[PDB]
From a paper:
In this study, we investigate AfuABC (Actinobacillus ferric uptake ABC), a BPDT originally identified as an iron-specific transporter in Actinobacillus pleuropneumoniae, a Gram-negative upper respiratory tract pathogen. The locus afuABC encodes 3 polypeptides corresponding to a conventional BPDT–AfuA (a periplasmic binding protein or PBP), AfuB (an inner membrane permease), and AfuC (a cytosolic ATPase). AfuA is a class II/cluster D periplasmic binding protein with two globular α/β domains linked by a dual β-stranded hinge. Instead, AfuABC is a trio of proteins that bind and transport sugar-phosphates such as glucose-6-phosphate (G6P).
To structurally characterize the ligand of AfuA, a 1.6Å crystal structure of ligand-bound A. pleuropneumoniae AfuA purified from E. coli was solved by use of sulfur single wavelength anomalous diffraction. In the binding cleft, we unexpectedly observed positive electron density and identified glucose-6-phosphate (β-G6P) as the bound ligand with a small (~5%) portion of density at carbon 2 corresponding to mannose-6-phosphate (β-M6P). In the binding cleft, His205, Asp206 and Glu229 interact multivalently with the sugar ring while Ser37 and Thr150 form hydrogen bonds with the phosphate moiety of G6P. Isothermal titration calorimetry (ITC) validated the binding affinity of A. pleuropneumoniae AfuA for β-G6P at 24 nM with favourable values of enthalpy and entropy change. The mutations T150A and S37A lowered but did not eliminate binding to G6P, whereas mutations to the sugar-binding residues (H205A, D206A and E229A) completely abrogated the interaction. This indicates that the hydrogen-bonding capacity of the sugar-coordinating residues is the critical determinant in mediating binding of potential sugar phosphates. In AfuA, the essential residues His205 and Asp206 form multivalent hydrogen bonds to the sugar moiety of ligands and function as the primary determinants of ligand selectivity. On the opposing end of the pocket, redundant phosphate-coordinating residues such as Ser37 cooperate to hold the phosphate moiety of ligands. The structures shown here are the first structural data for a non-enzymatic sugar-phosphate (i.e. G6P) binding protein.
Residue numbers in the entry: -1 to 319
Write the structure that this text describes.
């Protein structure tokens, strides 16, 4: 009873990806496989493969590189009927309109603190603001990912540019740098290392920290006092997808009540869902309760900002010097 196939480039966590693929395969009899890689890493792969695309759909990870892929003609437009159920402000959020990319979840940018480690290091108060993370007492005690690979890291750079302006954002990263022990390849690695007690502060998306906390890690999550940004998780069909009808079916599924709910019910992924008919995890953040910027996906999900800010970060924040 096999009904074709589907290849997914996934940029969410392995557990979320595997659950989505298995659930889709069992529901629709589509032989479904995925390859997981960072949001930025996946963008580069898709761009390199554009003359002979090797996947059908790009699922999860942050919207900005999917929006950039749309701008560059790497995607195939498709508006799912399930867009009707998506939070109106997020129905068609990318730079090029027409649902070349669609929003499947929301992740809040912030940081979390291993409180056992903070204590075991002699620091009395938990950082509450982005500003607090440049405190010299945190030298070598913070981790964040590298935006060459990680969507999360780019969401942070773009958030900081939107909060403070680009110049002061790069001032901030200059001051944050001495406190970073490791720039990680994956967005989620600071959460894992903070949970493990290998680092004291991780910067990333708070739902990853919430999952670690739910599993017993001594973490305190912080929505920084100045305000913060967020990812939209993206789903996009690749231009030249060999399995186009099945790709459209997967976009429908990813935007559906069932497909989104299964992320937190079975896929160990606690992002806030964009489908207004879906039940949220009790652990999901509620956007109406948070000090969030109006994150400009049209502006930051574009080559000018993504190439320019990432190359600027590489040049100044870690190379020289
Ligand atoms: O930063 P990246 O490696 O691109 O990954 C980004 C992804 O990271 C995960 O850990 C989060 O659960 C996802 O919500 C996010 O989309
Ligand atoms: Cl993973
Ligand atoms: Cl197909």
């Amino acid at each position: 009873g096999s009904k074709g196939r589907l290849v997914i480039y996934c940029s969410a966590t392995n557990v979320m990806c595997e659950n989505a693929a298995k659930t889709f395969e069992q529901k629709y009899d589509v032989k479904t496989s995925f390859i997981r890689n960072g949001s930025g890493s996946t963008f580069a792969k898709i761009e390199a493969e554009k003359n002979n695309p090797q996947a059908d759909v790009w699922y999860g990870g942050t919207l900005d590189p999917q929006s950039q892929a749309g701008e560059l003609g790497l995607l195939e437009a498709y508006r799912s009927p399930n867009i009707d159920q998506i939070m109106p402000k997020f129905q068609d959020p990318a730079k090029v309109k027409g649902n070349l990319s669609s929003a499947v979840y929301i992740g809040i940018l912030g940081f979390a603190v291993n409180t056992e480690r903070l204590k075991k290091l002699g620091i009395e108060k938990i950082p509450q603001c982005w500003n607090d993370l440049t405190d010299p007492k945190l030298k070598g005690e913070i981790q964040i990912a590298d935006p060459q690979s990680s969507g999360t890291a780019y969401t942070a750079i773009a958030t900081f540019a939107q909060l403070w302006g680009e110049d002061k954002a790069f001032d901030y990263f200059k001051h944050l740098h001495p406190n970073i022990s490791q720039y990680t390849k994956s967005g989620i690695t600071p959460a894992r290392n903070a949970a493990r007690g290998e680092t004291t502060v991780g910067i990333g998306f708070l739902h990853d920290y919430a999952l670690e906390k739910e599993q017993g890690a001594p973490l305190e999550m912080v929505v920084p006092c100045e305000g913060t940004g967020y990812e939209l998780g993206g789903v996009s069909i690749l231009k030249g997808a060999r399995n186009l009808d099945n790709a459209k079916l997967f976009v429908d599924f990813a935007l559906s009540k069932e497909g989104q709910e299964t992320a937190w019910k079975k896929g160990q992924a606690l992002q806030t869902l964009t489908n207004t008919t879906a039940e949220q995890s009790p652990l999901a953040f509620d956007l109406t309760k948070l000090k969030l910027i109006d994150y400009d996906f049209e502006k930051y999900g574009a080559s000018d900002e993504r190439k320019r800010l990432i190359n600027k970060w590489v040049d100044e924040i870690k190379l020289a010097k």
